[PDB]
């Protein structure tokens with residue numbers, strides 16, 4: 001599958017293959033995302049969850065969050081992909097984490113987008129300054145933080161203030177994806193994926209991992225896509241039969257737009273190729 005990658009490179013046809021994908025991709029209604037009452041719950045007018053796979057919040061008012069369940073039947077793994085929370089949706093974000101019983105959150109964007117403008121900070125920066133989400137009745141505490149060269153892992157305590165029940169959530173933040181373009185080497189992204197796997201966060205004993213970036217479709221899509229293709233290569237008789245384009249189209253049945261550029265598609269192929277070589281040994 002590496003020689004095919006070499007053939008697409010030699011051919012210069014990454015854009016063509018990427019457009020074949022956008023063309024073939026599923027189209028399902030997003031009627032709930034488009035209701036006038038939810039406008040302010042979407043970060044981007046052109047990225048919405050399909051009605052069929054959207055995550056529903058359990059509380060009473062309005063069950064809408066821009067988040068989709070991606071359920072990969074053959075790999076036996078599920079992910080929830082969601083946009084970076086808005087100042088008004090951080091309460092909803094953690095309510096979803098609570099309700100879906102997720103153990104991990106994986107973030108692939110910057111909160112200070114490029115050098116532009118800091119986005120809503122949805123976890124506490126300081127141990128002594130915990131956050132209380134009044135609308136969803138949740139308290140969130142930073143317990144520890146470990147800053148490595150290419151990612152930061154934080155341990156958070158999430159408490160449901162109704163029941164006083166408490167859960168440890170692991171937050172994995174990949175911090176070195178370049179502000180434009182894609183990493184030239186997938187080695188730190190793969191190491192990050194393997195750290196998240198090692199943590200047990202992706203175990204089917206837990207709710208699905210919550211994955212996000214800016215719109216929850218590009219960098220996020222790369223994480224989910226590389227993870228799933230690597231699972232399938234490890235699970236199939238013939239690891240050889242894994243077709244990344246087919247796996248991505250399958251993912252796109254659950255959330256639109258996964259993998260946002262031809263360069264991200266090529267990077268995803270490259271990460272699966274290098275991952276396989278590493279997991280091959």
Ligand SMILES: [Mg+2]
Pocket residue numbers: 126127
């Ligand atoms: Mg301090």
